[PDB]
């Protein structure tokens, strides 16, 4: 009889989407997950990430 | 170890950079896979070096 | 030391890495090809290929 007098507030709005320009979807500024764009001959990296 | 040559902490070193004039790397003729700096060891190795 | 005609380290790495350009991932064997590029005015010793 006392479970008639319960109240309920809505759950919080929580919006989950992607980041602003797909930020943190591609590794940058890292080594060991560094990207390489390089010749198919010698194969010298043209990407240095710091 | 200073005077006896009984070194034992050589395995903690992780990089060395050499620079002349504070603007030109001595390993700057691109002699190394990691172009600037020698690295003594790798922590986070996914490129198999 | 000799000061000239010995070594010139200008615009050359002292080692290169070559990615596979063929891969066969058979059941008991694996094949890999590499298209080597030995630059002009360079020489390779195959004793240091591994």
Residues of B with CB under 8 A from a CB of A: 30, 35, 42, 44-47
Name residues whose C-beta falls within 8 Å of residue A25's C-beta, 6 or more positions apart in sequence.
A18, A19
Strand partners, C24: C31
Are residues B33 and C15, on separate chains, in Cβ contact within 8 Å? yes
Nearest to C45 by CA among C22, C25, C15: C15
What was the elucidation method? Answer: cryo-EM
Rounded Cα distance between A42 and B30, Å, is 13
Q: Are C14 and B32 in contact (CB under 8 A)?
A: yes
Between residues 16 and 35 of chain C, which touch chain B (CB distance below 8 Å)? Answer: 17
Reduced to 3 states, what is the DSSP secondary structure of residue C48?
Answer: helix
Closest Cβ opposite residue A48 in set B35, B42, B47: B35
Name residues whose C-beta falls within 8 Å of residue A43's C-beta, 6 or more positions apart in sequence.
C16, C17, C18, C19
CA dihedral A28, B13, B31, A45 (to 10 degrees): -20
Chain B residues in contact with C9 by the CB 8 A cut-off are 29, 31
Chain A residues in contact with C33 by the CB 8 A cut-off are none
Chain B residues in contact with A48 by the CB 8 A cut-off are 35
The neighbour count for residue B36, using CB atoms within 10 Å, is 15
Are residues B46 and A48, on separate chains, in Cβ contact within 8 Å? no
């Amino acid at each position: 009889e006392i479970n008639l007098v319960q109240q309920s507030m809505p759950n919080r709005p929580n919006y989950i989407g992607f980041r602003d320009n797909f930020i943190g979807l591609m590794y940058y500024n890292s080594t060991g997950n560094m990207g390489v764009l390089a010749g198919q001959a010698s194969q010298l990296n043209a990407v240095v990430d710091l | 170890p200073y005077l006896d040559g009984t070194f034992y902490l050589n395995h903690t070193f992780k990089k060395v950079s050499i620079t002349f004039d504070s603007s030109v790397s001595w390993p700057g003729n691109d002699r190394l896979l990691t172009p600037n700096e020698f690295e003594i060891k790798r922590t986070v190795d996914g490129e198999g070096y | 030391a000799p000061t000239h005609d010995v070594t010139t380290d200008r615009s050359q790495r002292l080692t290169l890495r070559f990615v596979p350009v063929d891969r066969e991932d058979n059941t008991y064997s694996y094949k890999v090809r590499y298209t080597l590029a030995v630059g002009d005015n360079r020489v390779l010793d195959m004793a240091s290929t591994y």
